[PDB]
Amino acid sequence: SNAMHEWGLSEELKIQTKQMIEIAEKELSIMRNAIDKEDECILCKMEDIHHMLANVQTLAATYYIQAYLSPYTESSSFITTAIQHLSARKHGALIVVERNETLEALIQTGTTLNAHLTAPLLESIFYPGNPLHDGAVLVKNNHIVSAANILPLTKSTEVDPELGTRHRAAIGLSEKSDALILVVSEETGRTSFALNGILYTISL
Amino acid sequence: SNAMHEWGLSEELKIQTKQMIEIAEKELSIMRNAIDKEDECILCKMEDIHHMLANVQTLAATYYIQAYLSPYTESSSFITTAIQHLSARKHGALIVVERNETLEALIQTGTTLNAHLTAPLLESIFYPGNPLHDGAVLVKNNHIVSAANILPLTKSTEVDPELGTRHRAAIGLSEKSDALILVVSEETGRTSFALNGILYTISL
Amino acid sequence: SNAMHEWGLSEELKIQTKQMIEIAEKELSIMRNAIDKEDECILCKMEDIHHMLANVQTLAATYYIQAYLSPYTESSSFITTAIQHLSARKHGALIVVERNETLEALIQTGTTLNAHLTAPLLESIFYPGNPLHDGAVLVKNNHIVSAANILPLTKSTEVDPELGTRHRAAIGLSEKSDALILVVSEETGRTSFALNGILYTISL
């Protein structure tokens, strides 16, 4: 896509994120002053602030997906839709998005697809119990290159010791390349991505 | 602010600067040919060419403030207004704009403000004789972090020997960080900024 | 010359190039399936695919000229026009476009022009037999600095051995600087540019 245009879009998402942070800061400041007043109970404001922080999380995640992926794929909306659906169903998923660095020496290929990337196809691949669900999907731009791929697992001792093999594979690949690797937990439906050896929670 | 949009603005200011230089170049070429003619006296064109060069200086200064500061503050117009007012009154001023590098280990804090940045406040801080005028203001994006700050002074021998402590503090901080430091001289009202160990005259 | 705007234009040329490649890819897949049908003769599609490939070549060349030259000159359309005309007439040409690095220590000046760059002037310089045709033109932004210049010749043993002195001078200068050097062959009218020690065929 047009990198100049996409840069503008990234920048506007960043603006929106900062604006929700400012909204939350303002509401906390109001609460901090209101608690001193006998005719106020700041408990009535907690739902509002929780939602404000949920919005911060959503906007920031949208920002980083756009900033990190827009130069490398035109399919981020399709990927995000698939991820949301998989999360809701608690279907484990592991989606590698190739970036500037080539990955064929780091990934052991399961089944080659070279398919048009769509959300239904991503969701079908990760349906529990099916032949292609166990392992990683590789995405290059707007194609699903392959599925059921084997990735290197992090051996980092700075573990989150509760992390399963899906998460460790994302982290492990992200340590050896500039790939961004999305994970959906089969246990909780929590969605994450790994980039440069670090796992980040996202809410999409 | 939107970096893509701001880049376009920077680039247009650069275009305008180049255009003023071309205008000046053209007028000089006219003058150079006209002097040979006994029915011409090129002295009549000198005020025009002085003005053209004044415009070059103003456009270039606007260009560099925009290019160097726009990624790091949305308050450059407020800062510029304050500087213009301070210059006209010959009120000494020293304004640090934090850029990519953090400055807390390099600046000894005077008084913490954490204030909304406005021109009246900057101008009030630097009103001669007042408790906050002696030392530097620190700006981070759209906040005045602090005032009356102490900066490291350059010990360089290659700098103008007639430079006071305000100018040496600007140069000094600029040698240790990527901060841009604006100065208004209390002696002449001349406005400068230091960046990367070099002091540049500006006219706003 | 607004770099933000020019970046957008480069990016759109890239998009157009990718789209022509997709068109060619699609036609080939059609042909690959059609050959199995004995009521089809895929020879009728060869002209089409040849044209498609010619379009890929044209779009890609336009993209690279734009991406490599737009930050350094506003005269690329004039240069392209001159090159097209010289190519058609099979008039040898060698045009250095100065980029980020200065070239005065690497180029031995023939005749200094410091002229407004226009296509008629470039074409006049390289008219066969004339005083200025033998050697390189140097372009800095929108000026023809000089002509009949002498450039260093590549010593590279890994070159094409059928390359004449024009092509070797282009390659040679491109090894010592970031200049882009356009060549028109006097033998065939083939147009190339050298960049960083590599010669690329262009069609425009």
Side-chain angles (χ1 to χ4, degrees):
Chain A
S1 48
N2 193 135
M4 176 210 77
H5 183 84
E6 294 301 315
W7 190 30
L9 295 180
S10 296
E11 283 289 304
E12 286 299 325
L13 289 173
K14 188 153 78 182
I15 287 171
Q16 292 169 56
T17 307
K18 300 205 275 204
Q19 287 180 329
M20 192 66 50
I21 295 173
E22 290 184 349
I23 290 167
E25 292 175 279
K26 179 183 166 185
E27 193 69 26
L28 287 162
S29 173
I30 288 168
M31 189 175 316
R32 182 174 33 76
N33 285 113
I35 194 169
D36 282 330
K37 295 194 184 183
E38 175 174 316
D39 61 342
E40 302 233 20
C41 179
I42 66 161
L43 292 176
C44 69
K45 298 293 180 173
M46 294 294 165
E47 152 213 55
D48 290 344
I49 304 220
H50 285 288
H51 181 53
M52 288 169 182
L53 181 58
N55 288 346
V56 172
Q57 176 115 222
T58 293
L59 282 161
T62 306
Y63 167 70
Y64 287 111
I65 292 306
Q66 169 68 13
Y68 293 151
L69 299 190
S70 73
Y72 306 106
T73 175
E74 297 163 349
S75 293
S76 68
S77 65
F78 281 5
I79 298 173
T80 65
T81 300
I83 286 301
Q84 289 169 347
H85 288 344
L86 293 158
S87 180
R89 296 166 202 151
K90 296 192 180 57
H91 294 167
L94 182 65
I95 301 175
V96 175
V97 186
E98 188 173 324
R99 293 172 80 243
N100 186 241
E101 294 160 26
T102 269
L103 303 172
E104 77 297 326
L106 294 168
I107 294 177
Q108 292 147 298
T109 298
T111 290
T112 292
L113 282 84
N114 295 145
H116 176 49
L117 188 159
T118 60
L121 177 56
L122 287 168
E123 295 168 37
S124 172
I125 289 164
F126 294 111
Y127 198 93
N130 93 271
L132 295 176
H133 84 100
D134 185 24
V137 154
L138 171 59
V139 164
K140 171 78 167 185
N141 197 11
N142 308 308
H143 283 81
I144 293 160
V145 179
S146 48
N149 299 138
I150 300 160
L151 274 36
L153 306 176
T154 187
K155 58 154 173 281
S156 174
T157 67
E158 273 81 70
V159 218
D160 170 21
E162 198 156 308
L163 287 186
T165 46
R166 252 179 216 102
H167 294 266
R168 296 175 59 205
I171 297 172
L173 184 65
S174 79
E175 294 169 348
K176 299 297 181 173
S177 72
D178 78 326
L180 186 149
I181 308 91
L182 292 143
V183 189
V184 178
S185 175
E186 65 176 313
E187 198 178 327
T188 61
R190 162 175 282 174
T191 58
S192 302
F193 68 81
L195 187 71
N196 192 36
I198 301 166
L199 189 74
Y200 301 95
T201 301
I202 51 176
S203 76
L204 290 176
Chain B
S1 53
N2 192 135
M4 177 211 76
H5 180 85
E6 293 303 313
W7 190 32
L9 299 178
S10 297
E11 283 291 302
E12 286 298 326
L13 287 174
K14 186 154 79 179
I15 287 172
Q16 290 167 52
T17 308
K18 288 179 175 171
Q19 288 176 335
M20 288 301 338
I21 296 177
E22 293 181 336
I23 289 168
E25 279 177 290
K26 168 171 173 53
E27 195 69 25
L28 285 167
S29 176
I30 289 169
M31 186 178 316
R32 201 193 68 238
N33 289 114
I35 195 172
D36 286 327
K37 294 192 184 177
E38 97 162 51
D39 66 333
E40 302 230 22
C41 179
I42 65 160
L43 292 174
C44 68
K45 296 292 173 172
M46 290 294 167
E47 115 197 29
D48 291 346
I49 184 69
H50 167 86
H51 182 55
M52 289 169 183
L53 180 63
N55 291 343
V56 171
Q57 160 67 78
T58 297
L59 280 160
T62 307
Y63 169 67
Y64 286 110
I65 290 309
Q66 168 69 19
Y68 293 152
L69 299 191
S70 70
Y72 307 106
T73 176
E74 294 160 347
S75 296
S76 69
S77 66
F78 281 4
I79 299 178
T80 297
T81 302
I83 288 301
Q84 284 166 352
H85 288 164
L86 292 165
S87 175
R89 288 174 160 263
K90 304 203 222 315
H91 295 166
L94 180 65
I95 303 173
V96 173
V97 185
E98 185 171 327
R99 292 172 82 242
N100 191 58
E101 299 167 17
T102 69
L103 300 173
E104 79 292 331
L106 295 167
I107 294 174
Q108 293 92 68
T109 299
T111 287
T112 292
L113 282 84
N114 297 146
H116 176 47
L117 186 160
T118 58
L121 180 56
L122 286 170
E123 292 167 32
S124 175
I125 290 165
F126 292 112
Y127 198 91
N130 94 272
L132 293 173
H133 81 100
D134 183 27
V137 155
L138 170 57
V139 165
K140 171 74 170 188
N141 196 12
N142 309 126
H143 287 259
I144 292 162
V145 181
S146 48
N149 300 140
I150 297 159
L151 275 36
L153 307 174
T154 185
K155 68 143 166 291
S156 174
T157 64
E158 262 78 68
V159 291
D160 182 13
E162 296 290 337
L163 292 178
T165 47
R166 250 180 218 98
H167 294 267
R168 297 174 64 212
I171 298 168
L173 187 59
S174 78
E175 293 168 350
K176 299 303 187 168
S177 76
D178 76 326
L180 184 145
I181 309 95
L182 294 144
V183 188
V184 179
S185 166
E186 66 179 320
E187 303 187 352
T188 66
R190 173 196 46 161
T191 58
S192 302
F193 67 81
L195 185 75
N196 192 29
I198 298 164
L199 187 73
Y200 301 94
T201 300
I202 47 179
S203 110
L204 295 309
Chain C
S1 192
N2 188 134
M4 185 213 70
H5 180 88
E6 293 305 313
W7 190 30
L9 294 179
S10 296
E11 283 288 303
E12 284 299 326
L13 290 176
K14 186 153 79 182
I15 286 169
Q16 288 169 60
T17 307
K18 289 178 178 179
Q19 291 177 331
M20 195 63 52
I21 294 175
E22 293 179 329
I23 291 171
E25 280 176 287
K26 169 165 158 72
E27 196 65 24
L28 287 164
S29 78
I30 296 308
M31 185 177 318
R32 190 175 28 77
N33 286 116
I35 195 170
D36 281 333
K37 298 192 175 178
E38 280 285 276
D39 69 326
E40 304 243 11
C41 180
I42 64 163
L43 291 174
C44 71
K45 294 293 187 52
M46 291 296 163
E47 162 208 42
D48 291 345
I49 184 65
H50 282 289
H51 182 64
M52 288 170 179
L53 227 74
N55 289 346
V56 170
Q57 176 124 44
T58 298
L59 265 18
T62 308
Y63 167 72
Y64 288 109
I65 289 312
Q66 171 65 20
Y68 294 151
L69 300 190
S70 71
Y72 306 107
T73 175
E74 297 161 347
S75 294
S76 71
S77 65
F78 282 4
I79 298 172
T80 297
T81 299
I83 288 298
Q84 289 168 343
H85 287 168
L86 295 158
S87 177
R89 295 162 202 155
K90 295 190 182 58
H91 294 167
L94 183 63
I95 303 178
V96 175
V97 185
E98 191 171 322
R99 291 174 79 244
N100 188 57
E101 302 167 10
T102 68
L103 304 171
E104 78 290 333
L106 295 168
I107 292 178
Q108 300 107 82
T109 303
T111 287
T112 291
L113 286 80
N114 296 326
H116 175 55
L117 185 159
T118 57
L121 176 56
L122 288 166
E123 295 169 38
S124 176
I125 288 162
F126 293 110
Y127 199 89
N130 94 272
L132 294 176
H133 81 98
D134 184 27
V137 155
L138 170 53
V139 164
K140 171 74 170 189
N141 197 10
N142 309 127
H143 288 264
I144 293 166
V145 181
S146 48
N149 300 136
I150 299 162
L151 274 38
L153 304 175
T154 187
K155 329 276 178 171
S156 171
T157 65
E158 291 292 308
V159 288
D160 177 17
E162 294 293 330
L163 292 174
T165 53
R166 253 182 214 96
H167 296 265
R168 294 177 61 208
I171 297 169
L173 186 61
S174 79
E175 291 167 351
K176 301 294 179 173
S177 73
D178 78 324
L180 184 146
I181 308 96
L182 293 146
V183 187
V184 183
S185 168
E186 62 179 339
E187 307 188 353
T188 66
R190 167 174 284 174
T191 62
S192 300
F193 68 82
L195 184 73
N196 188 38
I198 297 161
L199 189 71
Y200 302 92
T201 304
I202 48 176
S203 164
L204 27 94

